[PDB]
Structures are given as structure tokens and as C-alpha cells.
């Protein structure tokens, strides 16, 4: 008969988020955080309150 067991381990999931490292590119990670904004809205706008002088 088998005896009891305890295991130490770590989280896995279905994430395909990927980060780069000096030694290895495209390493797949459980969790990640984008810090680059690549999107804008294509318009000229009022700034804090104030409409710009658009000549």
C-alpha cells in the first residue's frame, strides 16, 4: 500500500502572454502587464477645458 504525500508546486494557466528577457525572447508567462499605449483617437480636442485655436 502507498503512504501519504505532500507536494510543492506553482501556478499554471491558459495564458499566452509573452515577455522578453536578455537571455531569451518570447518567454510565455502566466501573467503580464503592458505598459505601452499604442492607440489614439485621430482627433484634435479641447485640452483640460479649453478649445485650441485651430487656424
Amino acid at each position, epitope marked *: 500500500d502507498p503512504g501519504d504525500q505532500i507536494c510543492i508546486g506553482y501556478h499554471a494557466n491558459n495564458s499566452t502572454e509573452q515577455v522578453d528577457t536578455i537571455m531569451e525572447k518570447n518567454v510565455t508567462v502566466t501573467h503580464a502587464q503592458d505598459i505601452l499605449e499604442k492607440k489614439h483617437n485621430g482627433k484634435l480636442c*479641447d485640452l483640460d*477645458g479649453v*478649445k485650441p485655436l485651430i487656424l
Partner: nanobody
Amino acid sequence: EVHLQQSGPELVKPGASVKMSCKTSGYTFTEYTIHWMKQSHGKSLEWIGGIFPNNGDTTYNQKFKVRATLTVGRSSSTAYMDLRSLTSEDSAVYYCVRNYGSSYGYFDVWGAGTTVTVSS
């Protein structure tokens, strides 16, 4: 300079509909948003809605959402408002007005005033 010429006073049977017009002049139509103000005769001012010419985007007051319909003739450089199924309530004065910049803007140029009377 910046003149907003609007429709002449009208009379409408209760339950019917009106279409008052506002003709813009003195600036470039598509650079400022146009709005309409209702003033119950010598009382207090109410905001109806606003429209941006260049793409035809509308922004309404909760109260007027159903009864009103702002339209723009870019070709004609003219702004329109349309009031559906009127009552004695709607008998008041209506102003076509240019709001300066966006959601957080001031009304700098106020139109003449189309004054509507609702009676059988």
C-alpha cells in the same frame, strides 16, 4: 461677424409638428457645435440638445429625447430642429445657439429666436 439667422415665428395645432431652421454665417460651419435652447416665456432657460455638423452627431436632454430631432444641412450650412406632437407645454421661444468647444463649452453666439405658439 458670427450671425445665426433662424426661422420666423410659427403657430401649430396641438398634436402636430414643427420644423424651425437656423442658418449659420460668419464662421466655418463644421468647426463648432450648434445647440438649441427653450425658454418658457419670461421664466427660465432649458437645454434641449446639440449637434455637430461635420459628422451629424447629436447630444440630447433626457426631457426632450423623444419629442425632438436635430438635423443639419451641411450643403445648405443650416441647422434644423423638429418638435413632434406638441402641447401647450411647448409653447415658448426657441434659440439656435453656437457652443464653443465641446461638452465643456460656453454658448457665445445666440440666435434671433423662433417663437412657437401651440393653439387650435
